[PDB]
Design a protein around this ligand. Structure first.
Ligand SMILES: [Co+2]
Lengths: 228, 203
C-alpha cells in the first residue's frame, strides 16, 4: 500500500536524533516487545511479510513518532485479532488493569524448553527465505528494466520513489518468498530476485546528484525489459 | 520536532508499558510466551550478537585477500567460515568501499539490518529521518549528520534493503595500519563504518 511508512524521498521529517550512545533496550517493555516476535511467529500469528504489513497499517502520525518497538506491538495485536487469537475486549480490560496496578504479577505459567530451543535455532540457524523454483530467471546482469507503476493496496515492497523508474539489473540472487503474496496471506509463491541500480537523476530529476545511484531489490514481477 | 498534539514522553511510556504488560499476560496464558523465552532473546542481543562480529569479518578481509574475495562473492557463506550467521543475515551481500566508490545502507520501508554481524540497529537507523533522506541526499546527509565529507567526484551508492538480502559495507582499511594485528585493526572498525555513514577510524 501507499502508506506513510514508505518514507524514501520524503522531505520535512526533521533532523536525525542520534544520542552519542544508547542501550539496546531502553525499557523493559522493549525487551518484551522484541521477544514477542519469535513467540507470535512460532504460534502462527503471522510470517515476516505479514508482520511488516501490520506495521504499515498503523495510524501514520502514531507510526512517525512512536518508539520503534511500539510498531511491533501494533502488528502483534493486528494479527492476533485477524486470526482470532487475541480478544480485543479482554486486551482492553487487561490494559486498564495494568494501568491501575502496574506491579501486579504476570499470570502463573510453566517454562517451556521447546521455546528456548526455538529461539536458539532461529537466532543461529536463521529463517532463510530463499526458495527453489522451476522457472529460470527472466532477467540477467546488464538488462535495462522498468519498475512497475502498480499500486496494490495490500502488502508489497514497491517504494513509491522507484515506481515507473527504469534501472539496470545488478545481480540475480535466486528466488525468494514473494511479499505481494506472502504479506497478504496468499503464500510464499516465490519469485526470482534482482538488485537493480537507479541513478539519482532518474529518481530525483535533472538536478539530482550526477554521481550517486540507489540500489533496490526487485522481485521478477516488479520489472519488465527495456534494452537487453 | 515539536508536535503540540503529543503527550509527554513519560505519559507515552506509562501507557505503552501497560499495553505491553496486558498483551504479555495474554500470550503467557496462551502458552506461547514465557519469561525464560523473553530473557533468552534479550541476553542474545545484549551480550552475544553485536558489531564486534562484523568487525572480525572486516579485519579478516583486510588481512586475507582470498577471504575478501570469498566475502564479496557470497557474504553468507564467507561469514559462516567464522561461525557468524543466522537470523536476519541469512542472505548477506558485502560491498567494498574504494577510492572511487562509497557505499551506505538503508531500509527505507522499515528497519532491515544485518543482525548477525551488527546486532540490533541503533534507533536512528530505524527512524524516518535517516531513512527518508539518505536515498535522496546522501552526500549532504553524510556531511551534516555524521561530519563525513564525500568529495562530489566520488560516487555514492545507497543500498535500499527492500528484500531479505542484507547489505553490509566493507570499509577501506585506514592508512598507517601496515602490519597491524587483527585485534589492533578491529579497534578501528565501527558499526557506523559497516553501515557506511562513517569511514573506519583514522590513525
Ligand atoms: Co526494515
Amino acid at each position: 500500500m501507499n502508506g506513510v511508512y514508505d518514507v524514501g524521498g520524503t522531505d520535512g521529517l526533521g533532523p536525525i536524533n542520534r544520542p552519542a550512545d544508547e542501550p539496546v533496550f531502553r525499557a523493559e517493555w522493549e525487551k518484551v516487545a522484541f521477544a514477542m516476535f519469535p513467540a507470535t511467529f512460532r504460534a502462527g500469528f503471522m510470517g515476516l511479510d505479514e508482520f511488516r504489513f501490520g506495521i504499515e497499517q498503523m495510524n501514520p502520525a502514531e507510526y512517525l513518532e512512536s518508539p520503534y518497538y511500539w510498531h511491533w506491538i501494533r502488528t502483534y495485536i493486528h494479527h492476533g485479532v485477524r486470526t482470532g487469537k487475541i480478544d480485543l475486549e479482554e486486551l482492553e480490560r487487561r490494559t486498564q488493569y495494568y494501568r491501575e496496578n502496574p506491579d501486579a504479577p504476570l499470570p502463573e505459567h510453566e517454562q517451556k524448553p521447546e521455546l528456548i530451543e526455538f529461539v536458539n535455532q532461529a537466532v543461529y540457524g536463521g529463517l532463510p527465505a530463499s526458495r527453489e523454483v522451476d522457472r529460470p530467471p527472466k532477467f540477467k546482469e546488464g538488462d535495462v528494466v522498468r519498475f512497475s507503476t502498480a499500486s496494490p493496496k495490500g502488502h508489497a515492497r514497491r517504494a513509491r520513489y522507484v515506481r515507473g523508474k527504469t534501472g539496470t539489473v545488478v545481480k540475480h540472487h535466486g528466488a525468494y518468498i514473494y511479499p505481494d503474496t506472502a504479506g497478504n496471506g496468499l503464500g510464499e509463491c516465490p519469485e526470482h530476485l534482482y538488485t537493480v541500480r537507479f541513478t539519482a537523476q532518474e529518481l530525483w530529476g535533472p538536478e539530482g546528484d550526477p554521481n550517486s545511484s540507489v540500489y533496490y531489490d526487485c522481485w521478477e514481477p516488479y520489472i519488465e525489459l527495456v534494452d537487453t | 520536532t515539536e508536535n503540540i498534539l503529543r503527550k509527554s514522553d513519560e505519559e507515552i511510556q506509562k501507557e505503552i508499558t501497560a499495553r505491553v504488560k496486558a498483551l504479555e499476560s495474554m500470550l503467557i496464558e496462551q502458552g506461547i510466551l514465557t519469561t525464560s523465552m523473553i530473557d533468552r532473546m534479550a541476553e542474545i542481543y545484549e551480550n552475544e550478537v553485536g558489531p564486534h562480529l562484523g568487525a572480525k569479518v572486516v579485519v579478516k578481509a583486510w588481512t586475507d585477500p582470498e577471504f575478501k574475495k570469498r566475502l564479496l562473492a557470497d557474504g553468507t557463506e564467507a561469514c559462516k567460515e567464522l561461525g557468524i550467521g543466522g537470523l536476519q543475515g541469512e542472505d548477506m551481500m558485502w560491498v567494498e568501499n574504494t577510492d572511487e566508490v562509497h557505499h551506505v545502507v538503508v531500509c527505507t520501508l522499515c528497519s532491515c539490518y544485518p543482525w548477525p554481524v551488527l546486532g540490533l540497529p541503533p534507533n536512528w537507523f530505524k527512524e524516518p529521518q535517516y531513512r527518508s533522506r539518505v536515498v535522496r541526499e546522501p552526500r549532504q546527509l553524510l556531511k551534516e549528520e555524521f561530519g563525513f565529507e564525500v568529495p562530489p567526484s566520488k560516487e555514492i551508492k545507497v543500498w535500499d534493503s527492500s528484500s531479505e538480502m542484507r547489505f553490509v559495507v566493507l570499509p577501506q582499511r585506514p592508512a598507517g595500519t601496515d602490519g597491524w594485528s587483527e585485534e589492533e585493526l578491529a579497534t578501528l572498525v565501527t558499526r557506523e563504518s559497516m553501515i557506511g555513514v562513517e569511514p573506519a577510524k583514522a590513525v
